[PDB]
Design a protein around this ligand. Sequence first.
Ligand SMILES: C[C@@H]1O[C@@H](O[C@@H]2[C@@H](O)[C@@H](O)[C@@H](CO)O[C@H]2O)[C@@H](O)[C@H](O)[C@@H]1O
Lengths: 306, 306
Amino acid sequence: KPFTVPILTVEEMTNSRFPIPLEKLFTGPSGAFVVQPQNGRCTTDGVLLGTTQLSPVNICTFRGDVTHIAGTQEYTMNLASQNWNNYDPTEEIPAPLGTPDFVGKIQGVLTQTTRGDGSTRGHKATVSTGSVHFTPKLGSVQFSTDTSNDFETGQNTKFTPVGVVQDGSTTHQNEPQQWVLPDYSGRDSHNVHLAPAVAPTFPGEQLLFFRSTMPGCSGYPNMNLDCLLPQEWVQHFYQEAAPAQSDVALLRFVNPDTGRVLFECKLHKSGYVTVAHTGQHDLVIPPNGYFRFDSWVNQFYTLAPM
Amino acid sequence: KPFTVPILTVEEMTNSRFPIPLEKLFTGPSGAFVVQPQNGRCTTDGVLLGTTQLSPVNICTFRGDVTHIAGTQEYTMNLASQNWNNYDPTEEIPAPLGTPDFVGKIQGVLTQTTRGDGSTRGHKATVSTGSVHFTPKLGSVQFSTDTSNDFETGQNTKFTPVGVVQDGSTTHQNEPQQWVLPDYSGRDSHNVHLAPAVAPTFPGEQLLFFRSTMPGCSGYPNMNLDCLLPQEWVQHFYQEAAPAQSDVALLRFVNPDTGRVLFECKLHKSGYVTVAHTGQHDLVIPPNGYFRFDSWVNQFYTLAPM
Ligand SMILES: C[C@@H]1O[C@@H](O[C@@H]2[C@@H](O)[C@@H](O)[C@@H](CO)O[C@H]2O)[C@@H](O)[C@H](O)[C@@H]1O
């Protein structure tokens, strides 16, 4: 079965690490960071990895029941699954599918319905994924809210993410840290079942990222968010399940107005892209440009320089 | 070129009328209302209709610049396109792409950034789509917020939707009205360029709806939300652009565990589904079930009762 990537343009696609559109293609050096995101991870033959699931809108959402921490505006959420069943911590995954894969303060809204009468409520909420109480793999996360008495126990509650925050009285853009994984089971625990770190291995190459800007809700957050694969590529490979004929799919990025190739890149079968470039660079592309799979090559193929 | 629908299950797909997952399938008689949604509208050969666009996360999202209404907590948003290009009110669409297609009060968050130093601001906001100031076709909508002084003008501002509210009456579940389109031009003009109203037209048939429950943020809202096509079907048809060989595609809903067909349905070329059933019915389906296109059929095809 022939392998393909979708014909959607970059701007027609969605970040796989937060529920926002893609904006641009970006390449840069990894530096002293290890790049190991857990959302937006899928092999080219359609095996989901890490915490990756298929829904573009369920990324960084949470569902469950909540309990008030007395005297505070904090609430503890006992996690349910995406369809309100019990969360199974025995599954060999790092954390529930769709769990945030970076350390930062994600602001959004906690909503709840009382099942007996259909009454509803909603409050500003922030989840700090570097917090000691961020333990999604154990089935519990804590939210800071703007209420101390308007959430009920034993009622379905959902967190919808909006954006990120930063304490402006502290060093600007010091958080989020997009390449720092949470400790999914809390302090002094060790993450397990992670999708692997990715890095270029060939001279002159860098990762190519699909970049968005997360909305900021307060302060001076670092809003950059790089994913390794658009969410639509995850969905496409999962359905197509085309076998990989080598370890590297050569893609050409084409301007359809001219038919001319802008650049070429390697889509590694384990689900990430490299390009021949060094340094930080926002790629200049026509907005109707698209990726086209052209041929299977090896790890020693030399790309045309970006 | 062979037509296909995605192999994703119901719970693996997304509502095309609000950025939330699908939950279930529902059928019922629909002479009580006009079924004319404008999001989630697409022909089987990939022509987008109404206000439909491709992004699951831009449904009920607004982008533009905001201006404060003095002496109130209200802000007017002068709308941009979803990629920040100008919105052209003379384009032959009913309203900006992704505009909500029901009368109701949608709560979310308005966010913006100052590029000069990266400061960010976020505030609770509600848009009442039945209000006289809901005039997206003219290029503006009005938000009720929790602030009077904390938004810059002339600055890109985003509304992220979260859920719906009910207020202004002791009566329960009388809003949203999911089958009542807003007046996209307000009182200045009637709605134009609408995707067609849909109805069963074969004896014994009813529409099949792809149903979610919208988050409720206050009061006693009617949270049911039915779409005619999953958002992933819209994206699939857009890319595949497979020609329709008749006006009616026969789909079978298959349990891949057993291989057995649970029911069959008609996917009409103009982009909606019917089943042979009389009465309101919540379909009971295996969670791994999915739709499979089997053949193009003529106008005289009698579906097996579901
Ligand atoms: C039904 C209740 O709704 C919310 O509270 C309401 C407020 O949001 C506001 O609409 C006003 C209306 O006068 O008062 C409240 O009724 C929830 O916060 C509350 O928990 C109930 O579910």
